[PDB]
Design a protein around this nucleic acid. Structure first.
Length: 67
RNA sequence: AUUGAAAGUUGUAGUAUGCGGUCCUUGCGGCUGAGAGCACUUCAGGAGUUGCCCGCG
């Protein structure tokens, strides 16, 4: 089984050319204290703030099966 | 079947929690659509005319 890379189609890129089409979003993992506190790490970060990037577009694929 | 062959950059994670666009406020006071004004002035229902005609309780 041969699998190629997943690339967005070239006409879509040519038409769009601009715009990031990549959105960076922040998620927080909550670790509260024993009774009700958010912990001694302060609320500058809730407990932690990590970041994730999400893409968007029309992609092309090609798969070969030599069964 | 190519220095290629086997291969997750993988798994778990809430920007969340409480926070009144709030309390007081006259569209308010005074103000003649009023005073003057002939549906008035001239005017015949008017001029002609046999209850008509015959009569033995």
């Amino acid at each position: 089984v041969k699998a190629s890379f997943i690339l967005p189609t070239e006409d879509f890129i040519k038409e769009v050319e601009g715009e990031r089409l990549i959105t960076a979003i922040k998620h927080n993992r909550v670790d509260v204290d024993e009774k009700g506190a958010i912990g001694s790490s302060k609320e500058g970060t809730a407990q932690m703030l990590f970041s994730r990037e999400y893409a968007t577009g029309l992609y092309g694929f090609s798969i070969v099966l030599d069964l």
